[PDB]
From a paper:
Herein, we provide high‐resolution structures for an EAL enzyme Bd1971, from the predatory bacterium Bdellovibrio bacteriovorus, which is controlled by a second signaling nucleotide, cAMP. The Bd1971 domain architecture is predicted to consist of an N‐terminal cNMP sensory domain (cyclic nucleotide monophosphate, postulated to bind cAMP or cGMP), a middle linker region, and C‐terminal catalytic EAL barrel. C‐di‐GMP turnover was increased ~8‐fold in the presence of cAMP or cGMP, further supporting the proposal that cNMPs are activators of Bd1971.
The crystal structure of full‐length Bd1971 was solved with both cAMP and cGMP ligands, to resolutions of 2.63 and 2.46 Å, respectively. The linear extension is only resolved in the higher resolution cGMP dataset and has relatively weak electron density for side chain residues; we have estimated the amino acid register in this region from physical attributes and conservation patterns of the segment, but it remains ambiguous. Dimer of full‐length cGMP‐bound Bd1971; one monomer colored individually by subdomain, the opposing monomer colored white. The nucleotide‐bound pocket of Bd1971ΔEAL‐mid reveals cAMP to be bound in the syn conformation; of the two full‐length, bound‐state structures of Bd1971, this pose resembles the cGMP complex (syn) more closely than the cAMP complex (anti). However, both the anti‐cAMP and syn cGMP conformations allow for the side chain of Met59 to occupy the “down” rotamer that stacks with the nucleotide base, whereas the syn cAMP Bd1971ΔEAL‐mid conformation places Met59 in a conformation more similar to the full‐length apo structure. The other notable difference between the Bd1971 anti‐cAMP and syn GMP complexes is that Ser68 can make a specific interaction to N2 of the guanine ring —protein kinases specific for cGMP often encode a Ser/Thr at this position in contrast to cAMP‐specific domains utilizing Ala (Osborne et al, 2011). The similarity in binding pose between an anti‐cAMP and syn cGMP has been observed in some other cNMP sensor proteins, including CRP, where the cAMP N6 and cGMP O6 occupy similar positions (Passner et al, 2000; Seok et al, 2014).
Numbering used by the authors:
A (entry chain B): 6 to 111, 136 to 401
B (entry chain A): 6 to 111, 117 to 123, 139 to 402
Write the structure that this text describes.
Amino acid sequence: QSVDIHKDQIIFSEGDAGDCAYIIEKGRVLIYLTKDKEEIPLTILGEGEIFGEMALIDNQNRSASVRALEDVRLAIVTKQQVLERVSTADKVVQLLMRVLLKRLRRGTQSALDQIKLENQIFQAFQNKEFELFYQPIVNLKNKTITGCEALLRWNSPQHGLVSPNLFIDIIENSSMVIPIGHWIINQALKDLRTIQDQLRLNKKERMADDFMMSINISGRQFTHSDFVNNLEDLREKHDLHTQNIKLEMTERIMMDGAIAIDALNQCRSLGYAISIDDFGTGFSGLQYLTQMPISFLKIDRSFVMKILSDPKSKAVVSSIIHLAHAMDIEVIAEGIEHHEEALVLETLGARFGQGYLFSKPVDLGRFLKLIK
Amino acid sequence: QSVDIHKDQIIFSEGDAGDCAYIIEKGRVLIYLTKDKEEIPLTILGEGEIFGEMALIDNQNRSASVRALEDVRLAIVTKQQVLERVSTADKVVQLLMRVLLKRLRRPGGSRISSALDQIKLENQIFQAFQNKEFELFYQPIVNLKNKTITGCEALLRWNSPQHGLVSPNLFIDIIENSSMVIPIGHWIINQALKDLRTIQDQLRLNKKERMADDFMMSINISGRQFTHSDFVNNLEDLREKHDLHTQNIKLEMTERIMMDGAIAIDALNQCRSLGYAISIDDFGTGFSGLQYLTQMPISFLKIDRSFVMKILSDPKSKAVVSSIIHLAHAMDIEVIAEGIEHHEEALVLETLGARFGQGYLFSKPVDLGRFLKLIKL
Ligand SMILES: Nc1nc2c(ncn2[C@@H]2O[C@@H]3COP(=O)(O)O[C@H]3[C@H]2O)c(=O)[nH]1
Ligand SMILES: Nc1nc2c(ncn2[C@@H]2O[C@@H]3COP(=O)(O)O[C@H]3[C@H]2O)c(=O)[nH]1
Ligand SMILES: [Mg+2]
Ligand SMILES: [Mg+2]
């Protein structure tokens, strides 16, 4: 909505209640204070400048008066429009705005903490405090280790064992995912080379050929272009085959719809296995799985820990397993802690499993012992 | 990540390139300008204050110098941490930041070379609402086996050529993540409930007593209006206003409501205890709340057109649809398959076990007057 004001009209005065702000589309306006009939100019605003935001942002009165220097045309921005856009902005951006506002007139402790935590995470990465552990994936019927998932671990000397609940999300929607993710993939692929070599050296030739290293890939690093180029470079570096490398993704990817179907279809043509991690939670979902080069899906612990108790959870799990089979997708059920859970999941048709029942995540050295 | 500076150290000078910002953890710093060797104090900052952000936000030089007044400890905030959060922010927020920055740094004329358009579109939408340009149409939901109209969905329409150059989805989206959803949504619900009263009265007056009792008016409820407190109070007020029963009113909700998890289960259980029917509008698209579907007062789920239009062509889409239908039955949830445009689609969906359907095959959305005629057939 657009409004035309004549030259010399006082649009509002210092000390008035704020109703709305205004974006100048044509002409010029003067911002002034008055102090005993002496008019003190602050500035002249022209096309594109917004004015009157300040009263709206923190329900104070007008900090200055505003007069049209010539005929002007103003677009009206409402209190609610400004408050809405501000309240939904990033909390560090909200902090930055509050500090600027208060200085110009002359959730903060949560926002400073987020900034600090990020810097603490990345310094710990560069101080070599992270390592990968490996959690066996087992064939449910014959109890054989068929692969492993690479899981990030923070062994901070000050705090002891730092929980992945904290730092994984910070890492994943931060630019540091790219350097951290490049390190993860290289390490996983390096340790895959070692697992295969050791398996062969102990005459388990077929196990080595069929072994799947499962690597968690975030959306950010997946949609970063040349992700596939670096992934390929790192595979050839360690002389590995695509068929032994499974890329675990959260369905939040498909979100990027056609684009996604893109790289995912890319990799699949190279022979990488693609897996939907935490299926049925998050945006890890049914609708896109219809048209996806998906070889695996993981049934989240949240379902598995309710199999025996809540029989409506047993229904949902059977549905997912039977659906996966109808699309020739195989299933890994994770969070398996009891033999009774593994029994039921095998009867329902899940081929693979992971969890404490079989083994917790362990360092490479202990994993190399488990496979023997 | 933490750095200790001695009393009197110039941390940086006015005119330098910005590397990082700092949070003061201990002590005090002076912000000053220099103007012919006269040092002009702007302020003293203490514990918790941030400084040096401004150069980072828009790659300008330092607007002032900063000296430690005593021994200080600074936490480092990186250029990268500021620039990412700033560059990804809303364009109105970006405008606000630029204006504040320039004003704090500051007779010449200040200028700024979308944004204004987003603001205007919203005001155009809301003025059209208040100028009575919106109305509800109703699309029959039919029992697939016996072809009988069992209910209808209320669908919002804008009667203007302007609806037009926005896109049909887009005007609904503007409404739904804007505060205007509350006044627009209150009008929608009242109108739908008013027109439900009329459908039932006419059904009774023609001795179709069982049809009137079983008739479901389906109303799309956005997340914003659902999580707004006193949503249930207004909904109840409007039901009693039109002397209606909860059992005839179905609340269609996006699956994205389950991003609240525990809070969402309670809010739905509140409506369900009152006797409202709850339906998941877009099942299997958008947010996956299947872990939660285990414990949800859900009576209906709708299979989206995006699945239905791929049944015959892409047989992996046929697989997913059968799975959803069979799963819904295992939880005593009934299914409405929407976007049904051909008899062959309705055939397949009935064989798979879907009870209800909507789409062009049966009828497009129509005004109340035409809907009242369709009922009598
Ligand atoms: N306080 C202040 N406001 C300014 C300045 N330059 C432009 N303005 C605008 O003038 C407006 C006066 O009313 P508000 O306080 O609502 O919002 C103010 C700003 O939008 C300045 O240097 N100081
Ligand atoms: N320009 C300006 N900067 C201030 C003021 N008060 C505190 N500061 C801080 O001083 C810093 C000087 O360098 P920057 O411009 O990078 O960031 C500035 C702000 O963080 C003030 O009144 N004006
Ligand atoms: Mg996983
Ligand atoms: Mg709908």
